[PDB]
Design an enzyme around this catalytic site. Structure first.
Site, PDB file in Angstrom:
ATOM      1  N   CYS A 117       4.107   1.287   9.232  1.00 20.73           N
ATOM      2  CA  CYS A 117       3.895   0.159   8.333  1.00 20.73           C
ATOM      3  C   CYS A 117       5.227  -0.278   7.743  1.00 20.73           C
ATOM      4  O   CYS A 117       6.106   0.546   7.482  1.00 20.73           O
ATOM      5  CB  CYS A 117       2.912   0.501   7.225  1.00 20.73           C
ATOM      6  SG  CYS A 117       1.296   0.979   7.891  1.00 20.73           S
ATOM      7  N   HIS A 133       0.805  -1.207   0.000  1.00 21.23           N
ATOM      8  CA  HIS A 133       0.000   0.000   0.000  1.00 21.23           C
ATOM      9  C   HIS A 133       0.856   1.283   0.000  1.00 21.23           C
ATOM     10  O   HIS A 133       0.274   2.372  -0.066  1.00 21.23           O
ATOM     11  CB  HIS A 133      -1.018  -0.035   1.162  1.00 21.23           C
ATOM     12  CG  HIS A 133      -0.437   0.149   2.528  1.00 21.23           C
ATOM     13  ND1 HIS A 133      -0.371  -0.867   3.456  1.00 21.23           N
ATOM     14  CD2 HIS A 133       0.042   1.251   3.146  1.00 21.23           C
ATOM     15  CE1 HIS A 133       0.154  -0.405   4.578  1.00 21.23           C
ATOM     16  NE2 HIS A 133       0.412   0.879   4.411  1.00 21.23           N
ATOM     17  N   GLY A 173       2.874   5.668   9.927  1.00 23.37           N
ATOM     18  CA  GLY A 173       4.227   5.595   9.454  1.00 23.37           C
ATOM     19  C   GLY A 173       4.975   4.361   9.910  1.00 23.37           C
ATOM     20  O   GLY A 173       6.107   4.167   9.488  1.00 23.37           O
TER      21      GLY A 173
END
Ligand SMILES: O=C1N[C@@H](CC2CCCCC2)C(=O)N1c1cncc(F)c1
Ligand SMILES: O=C1N[C@@H](CC2CCCCC2)C(=O)N1c1cncc(F)c1
EC number: 3.4.19.12
Lengths: 305, 305
Positions: free
Chosen positions: A145, A41, A143
């Site tokens: 991820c 993503h 942030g």
């Protein structure tokens, strides 16, 4: 003595963390040999988030759109491919800090350490369990991820988790390092049901053994039980059923303490039925289920890496 | 979101751990620039332990008696000197992995990360607090002596603790990196009183703020209190007195949440007087005092290193 929620030393993993930017999104990547792994993503924008067509979004991207930075070092991207929910960015340099490593898909109830990162820089390390419903109860801000979970055996890092998202309930979901989610989750901005969760029975028993080894013994009683009787109680209190495989893996702790596994089950049955009466066990006022039997033995025996 | 007991990433410290052997005793040392630091009790034997004459014991030793090993490489010892309860071994090679670092003597109630090591090899990392009575509730087995505690700010490691001993009560005592014990303790095998511990009030309040930020807010109530009224309750429950300096350092969390510090004190008052009624806060069934206000802000804002 003493018993702490202990993480693995994180140095081997710190040297693999990079920043990945695509468009306006920045998150973390994992740099092993000449491949960087990150959540797919990274290629989305806010309009995309409710149901991204990741194939179409990735087709608009080329190698030079993926900005990969390892500390101050910029990496050169020479290929990209999507595997399930992860992106694999081939870079022209192998990470000189690559540890011996494996990719593992763990079972629910197992534990691992998380190295929480932002912009490719490590923030902190903590231990957590994969819940029976395949969520984790982490500490992840926007942030984070691409932060990874792992275990270490001797010199080998087994990577088992990559962080992808926070569900509306505030619990966390992610993938193995082949990009397959744990649980039913998908990488889109939708409300998503997690299973009924349950308490990891074999881990609670392991922790009760850890307590005895440390001299917290007040909950030991004069009783025993059967596996069948204990599991009737476990079901009533939303505990995972105990199997003989679980009894087997508790063998070493039973031997060390001399307390038979079914005797410890009868202590746990009494704790479930009567509560703790305002007392504590290993500094906790509830029954702790984030230590596996292997964790308890390791921490009690001093295994190093 | 989510809130975890988070340690600092340990990689910068892992690269400084060595094994130190003197006679038949092996423990851990810390290699910074061209000096190795370790507990001076590496030079004792079992006859010595009840009251070692460390000056006399050290006089029987020369440079070549201190075996210092970094993974596989042996270091050459070119000087030795005892400072308080630590030995300083000058070696002929500066550690190439030396981070930017400082030695700090911390205050009671402050927190740090511990890298537990055996034979110079890191085992695990966990966060803990210096108790008001200058003990720590660690996880340390035989051979862990010389393991260190630390904090990190940007690129700089502040070393604040070196582990020396386990008291008969099972809690842990150690020194700053100048070899001065925290607390009244001495490095000899004697029963030693630690004296009354208390709960770290300003930390409990910080964690209640962490709870609200993460959406645990069932304990907020319609009440307020005064500093004087709150401290009468604090004293009754063996809590440290809250001072205006403590209220001041909670300022940022008060601003973020809109909950005045004295309103949060009235929530804590009610929890102390009435308990948790079988509920939990941030996964815990007791009031947690091992997060400082700085820790809560850092974890809730994603500060990296
Ligand atoms: O940073 C992000 N970005 C989205 C990714 C999410 C992926 C699927 C499409 C919708 C967006 C997210 O869930 N988080 C996040 C994770 N853990 C803790 C947080 F507080 C936030
Ligand atoms: O390994 C040692 N050696 C003694 C040193 C101790 C120094 C003062 C003289 C008497 C011996 C010790 O206290 N431990 C230990 C530490 N933490 C957890 C443990 F389980 C044991």
């Amino acid at each position: 003595s003493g018993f702490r929620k202990m993480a693995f030393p994180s140095g081997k993993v710190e040297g693999c963390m990079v920043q990945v930017t695509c468009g306006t999104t920045t998150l973390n990547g994992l740099w092993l040999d000449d491949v960087v792994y990150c959540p797919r993503h990274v290629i989305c924008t806010s309009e995309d988030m409710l149901n991204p067509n990741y194939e179409d979004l990735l087709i608009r991207k080329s190698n030079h759109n993926f900005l990969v930075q390892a500390g101050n070092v910029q990496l050169r991207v020479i290929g990209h491919s999507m595997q399930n929910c992860v992106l694999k960015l081939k870079v022209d340099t192998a990470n000189p800090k690559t540890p011996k490593y494996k990719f593992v898909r763990i079972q629910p109830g197992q534990t691992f350490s998380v190295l929480a990162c932002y912009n490719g820089s490590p923030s902190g390390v903590y231990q957590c369990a994969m819940r029976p419903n395949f969520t984790i109860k982490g500490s992840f801000l926007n942030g984070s991820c691409g932060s990874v979970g792992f275990n270490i055996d001797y010199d080998c890092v087994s990577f088992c988790y990559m962080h992808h998202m926070e569900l509306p309930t505030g619990v966390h979901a992610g993938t193995d390092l082949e990009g397959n989610f744990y649980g039913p989750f998908v990488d889109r901005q939708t409300a998503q049901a997690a299973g009924t969760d349950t308490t990891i029975t074999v881990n609670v028993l392991a922790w009760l053994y850890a307590a005895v080894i440390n001299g917290d013994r007040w909950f030991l009683n004069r009783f025993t039980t059967t596996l069948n009787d204990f599991n009737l109680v476990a079901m009533k209190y939303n505990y995972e059923p105990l199997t003989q495989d679980h009894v087997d893996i508790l063998g070493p702790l039973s031997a060390q303490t001399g307390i038979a596994v079914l005797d410890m089950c009868a202590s746990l049955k009494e704790l479930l039925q009567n509560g703790m009466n305002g007392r504590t066990i290993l500094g906790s006022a509830l029954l702790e289920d984030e230590f596996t039997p292997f964790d308890v033995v390791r921490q009690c025996s001093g295994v190093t890496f």
